Symmetry: C4
Subunit: 132 residues, 4 copies
Amino acid sequence: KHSYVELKDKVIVPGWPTLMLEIDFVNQFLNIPFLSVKEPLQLPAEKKLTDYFTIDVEPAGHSLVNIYFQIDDFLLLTLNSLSVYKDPIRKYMFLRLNKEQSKHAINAAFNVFSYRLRNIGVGPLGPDIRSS
Amino acid sequence: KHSYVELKDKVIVPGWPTLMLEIDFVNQFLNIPFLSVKEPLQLPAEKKLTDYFTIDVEPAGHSLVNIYFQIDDFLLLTLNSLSVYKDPIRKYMFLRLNKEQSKHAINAAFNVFSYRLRNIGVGPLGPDIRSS
Amino acid sequence: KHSYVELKDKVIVPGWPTLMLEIDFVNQFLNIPFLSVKEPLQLPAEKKLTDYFTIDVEPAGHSLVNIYFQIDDFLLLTLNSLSVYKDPIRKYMFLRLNKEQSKHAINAAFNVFSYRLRNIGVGPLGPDIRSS
Amino acid sequence: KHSYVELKDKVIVPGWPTLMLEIDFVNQFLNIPFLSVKEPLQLPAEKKLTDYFTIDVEPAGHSLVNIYFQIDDFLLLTLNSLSVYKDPIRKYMFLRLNKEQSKHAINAAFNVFSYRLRNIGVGPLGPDIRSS
Ligand SMILES: Nc1nc2c(ncn2[C@@H]2O[C@H](COP(=O)(O)O)[C@@H](O)[C@H]2O)c(=O)[nH]1
Ligand SMILES: Nc1nc2c(ncn2[C@@H]2O[C@H](COP(=O)(O)O)[C@@H](O)[C@H]2O)c(=O)[nH]1
Ligand SMILES: Nc1nc2c(ncn2[C@@H]2O[C@H](COP(=O)(O)O)[C@@H](O)[C@H]2O)c(=O)[nH]1
Ligand SMILES: Nc1nc2c(ncn2[C@@H]2O[C@H](COP(=O)(O)O)[C@@H](O)[C@H]2O)c(=O)[nH]1
Ligand SMILES: Nc1ccn([C@@H]2O[C@H](COP(=O)(O)O)[C@@H](O)[C@H]2O)c(=O)n1
Ligand SMILES: Nc1ccn([C@@H]2O[C@H](COP(=O)(O)O)[C@@H](O)[C@H]2O)c(=O)n1
Ligand SMILES: Nc1ccn([C@@H]2O[C@H](COP(=O)(O)O)[C@@H](O)[C@H]2O)c(=O)n1
Ligand SMILES: Nc1ccn([C@@H]2O[C@H](COP(=O)(O)O)[C@@H](O)[C@H]2O)c(=O)n1
């Protein structure tokens, strides 16, 4: 036994590259800055993300929704090592969607078609941003 | 005499199945997680929902809107029994729509065409989610 | 000299009929529950609203916008008398738009094409709602 | 060394003309009231804005985004002088986007195509608004 802990907004540090959780429902999508990281996330060219990563979109209110995670050890290790923030990833986590995001989930009735983690570049001032 | 009490977000427990209040206006729709439940909600194949359930969408501010309910005894009984949360349904209730939802109501001028309660499944981690 | 006071959300009482401020920009519209009233608002069949009512949409932040009002005596008198709430209308008022509304104003750059006050009916439970 | 300070909502005073930060991503745009000013902002007919002004759109959470600025001295001087508020512009600033704005940035993945500062007029009551 165990519990789903919150991946807080603190794990996103501005000026660093970003890992974007991308989720398609079954029409309805949802882009969520996941984790600011030091290097890209290349996976083994063998394996797909869905082997180490399973996600559940549940409602938590009439207006609000959360996303729950199960992160198998390999990814948990890869991600802690990649993180700008001090080793923040646990096997069982969730994050909250804001009223705006929440409602997209709710309309598509929570039904995840696909999802993936994309590397998103930093911008012109990023160097200078994070050094401040 | 009596008063309309609030169906709070607490009645939605994540990991459990969900009853979705679906509302069409007269173009304009509105999906609202209503109540997390243990089993589905089958009604008598005879009766329609609208016999035990009447709803009113009124504004409560310049930006915000509420939905009011009258739940006839049969449904009030069926729902309390179905609820994951301890017996939360009263005959006269309302719930608040968030600024985002509110505005859809306001644009369609509150005019409800139709409405219904749909069963929405749980997702992959749901078992594990609610046991935490 | 004088100041623009806030028409608060309190002046909207649920269960009563509603006066909707409708605003078109120059594509971009904006519906705002204005004032809950006891009877409809018929104007003199002679005069248009714009004779007693002039409105200004200004920004108040990077994300937020307000609407300012000048209400000539006739309308100020008609409206206080119509109000469910105790005589709330002053000659110079404003109201705040929520982040959601605000942004529609901002995109259309605040440029009001037209505006009007429409009577909006009450719904099925309205009687019972306001008597609670 | 140095830090990016916040251009607060206070620098927008209602009743005064407005400078609108306009940003196109690479489909996705974003209009943000930047700074309320006393006169228009004409630049040298020679130079483009992008010579004194470079901007970076970074995420600060799972749901939220900021815009960072580098304002070269000429513009910093021109803007302080133009400002209604007491000399508020520093070389390195940022401003927060609200959940609504944030999400447009996030979807287009932060990738700024173009941006510019437009003069936006005041409205009918503006005179009277700011004198109150
Ligand atoms: N609640 C939830 N349902 C999901 C998820 N991924 C897929 N689904 C499917 O979505 C269904 C609920 O939405 P529905 O298809 O009934 O509108 C469930 O039966 C489930 O099979 C998820 O992450 N959360
Ligand atoms: N306010 C409100 N009006 C409703 C509702 N359901 C139907 N209506 C109808 O919507 C009308 C108000 O919107 P309108 O059609 O004038 O734009 C009322 O006259 C009423 O007949 C409801 O739940 N709330
Ligand atoms: N700021 C503001 N501008 C308005 C309003 N009504 C009309 N306008 C016009 O909108 C112009 C600003 O928007 P623009 O047309 O430059 O995008 C002003 O020059 C003004 O003539 C109002 O209520 N507020
Ligand atoms: N993060 C960020 N990226 C920007 C900005 N302006 C341009 N970009 C470009 O956007 C890319 C990230 O978005 P992508 O094109 O990978 O979806 C970066 O590689 C960068 O070259 C900005 O202001 N912020
Ligand atoms: N984060 C977001 C933003 C928009 N969307 C959807 O994708 C489409 C594009 O919406 P906008 O035109 O509002 O960007 C709409 O159908 C909207 O419902 C989404 O699914 N997830
Ligand atoms: N909860 C919601 C979400 C969207 N809608 C409406 O249905 C349509 C789909 O909107 P999106 O493209 O933003 O999903 C729009 O016309 C929007 O006004 C609604 O009526 N209730
Ligand atoms: N309160 C509102 C809601 C939507 N709108 C606009 O009218 C159109 C209908 O938007 P939805 O499809 O989101 O309802 C969009 O162009 C939107 O920008 C508006 O101008 N004022
Ligand atoms: N501030 C805003 C508002 C809308 N938009 C986008 O421009 C289009 C117009 O959206 P509405 O119809 O909601 O006004 C949509 O594709 C929306 O994603 C934007 O990019 N920045």
